[PDB]
Amino acid sequence: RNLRVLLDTAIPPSFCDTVSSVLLDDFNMVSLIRTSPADSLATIKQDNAEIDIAITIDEELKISRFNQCVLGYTKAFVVAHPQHPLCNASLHSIASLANYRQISLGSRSGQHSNLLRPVSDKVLFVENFDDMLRLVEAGVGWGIAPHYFVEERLRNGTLAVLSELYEPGGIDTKVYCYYNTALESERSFLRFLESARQRLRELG
Amino acid sequence: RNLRVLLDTAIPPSFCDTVSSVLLDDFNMVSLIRTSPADSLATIKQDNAEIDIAITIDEELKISRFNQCVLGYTKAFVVAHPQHPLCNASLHSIASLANYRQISLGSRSGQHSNLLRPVSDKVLFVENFDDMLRLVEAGVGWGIAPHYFVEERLRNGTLAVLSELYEPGGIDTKVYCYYNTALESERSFLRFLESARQRLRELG
Ligand SMILES: CC(C)Oc1ccc(-c2ncc(CNc3ccnc(C(F)(F)F)c3)cn2)cc1Cl
Ligand SMILES: CC(C)Oc1ccc(-c2ncc(CNc3ccnc(C(F)(F)F)c3)cn2)cc1Cl
Secondary structure, eight states: OEEEEEEETTSOHHHHHHHHHHHHHTOSEEEEEEEOHHHHHHHHHOGGGOOOEEEESOOOSOOOSEEEEEEEEEEEEEEEOTTSGGGSOSOOOHHHHTTSOBOOBOOTTSOOOTTTSOSSSSBOOBSSHHHHHHHHHTTSOBEEEETTTHHHHHHTTSSEEOOSSSSTTOEEEEEEEEEEGGGGSOHHHHHHHHHHHHHHHHTO | OEEEEEEETTSOHHHHHHHHHHHHHTOSEEEEEEEOHHHHHHHHHOGGGOOOEEEESOOOSOOOSEEEEEEEEEEEEEEEOTTSGGGSOSOOOHHHHTTSOBOOBOOTTSOOOTTTSOSSSSBOOBSSHHHHHHHHHTTSOBEEEETTTHHHHHHTTSSEEOOSSSSTTOEEEEEEEEEEGGGGSOHHHHHHHHHHHHHHHHTO
């Protein structure tokens, strides 16, 4: 039968690399789908999408018709222009960053998870990290981005990090894997889980 | 828009690993499809399948509505049971292997490419390498298989190689990449080509 895997934008692509390497060996067709973390959960719930596996950071225990396991952790950072105001203060709190503009990830349904619910009251919603960064690089605000996006930008100084007194080394965020009940009865999935887990570990 | 990549069974899975790693970065949805090498070409020709990229070993310059490039080489071997008759003779020719039973890959359309057209006159068609090997291990005949299938079997002695005076180190077979004209105008594809090429090289 056909499979349809979903990976949110927070998960780096070299992960879907190793996901498809494994699943094809014991399948016919594997469809990889990318979505904003704000849209990931809402997508699988639609019975119309026939999503069989979802791999995202958003959290929910009330998801129905699916199950839930943990694959590992990804990494995120609070970034802002190097000359952005809050780099002068090595001691900026949540209530201090809530008074500036955040570049959040707006959802296509309007709902906002407790995960990606913006922190600031002055917010400017986007649908993807590429646009979140095009703004943050212009100094329009700050935002929380995956490590793989802000990796190059941080090394060459186009972009600085604000989240080091909060959590040194970046904000670790669980990657979860929702999966439809029927795949419980199958090896390859268990083989995929063990490989996906060892795959997210190697990214540290 | 949506993409649908096709990989034949002769190409190992860790290759579709690196194919999807690259394409997703600059796409929304990538669908990976596995097919017997005998069925690969016939599939893309069907305009009903909406195949956008095909990656197989079968050869044809008259393919219409597509283009054609070369990605690298895979490897194959002529294998047979270790106690199979033709291991006694270190000097078996094509006309000597044509008198025994071959386990070929039959096609769903009946047609047989000049590539996978069986060599022997006594042939037993299968649709996949797993069944080709279940027979060859039983000593029902010999067959031409990809390196990644007969890798473990050869190391632990469950299966021997007959194709070393023909071509030492295994029969190298070009992997090609057929691709629809519209993708000519795009970077990621050129980025995919250069990565897929360096990916098949690393498998040597
Ligand atoms: C420096 C300190 C004073 O400020 C902050 C520290 C931490 C947080 C913070 N909020 C939400 C979460 C939940 N997880 C994510 C939310 C959004 N996106 C992502 C990802 F980028 F991974 F996709 C992950 C994690 N951390 C917010 C602030 Cl403002
Ligand atoms: C030892 C010698 C005396 O015998 C032989 C030597 C070589 C050949 C031979 N024939 C066809 C081709 C074409 N390429 C493939 C055909 C089928 N399958 C595959 C793959 F496995 F890769 F998918 C590749 C290559 N080689 C046949 C014989 Cl009998």
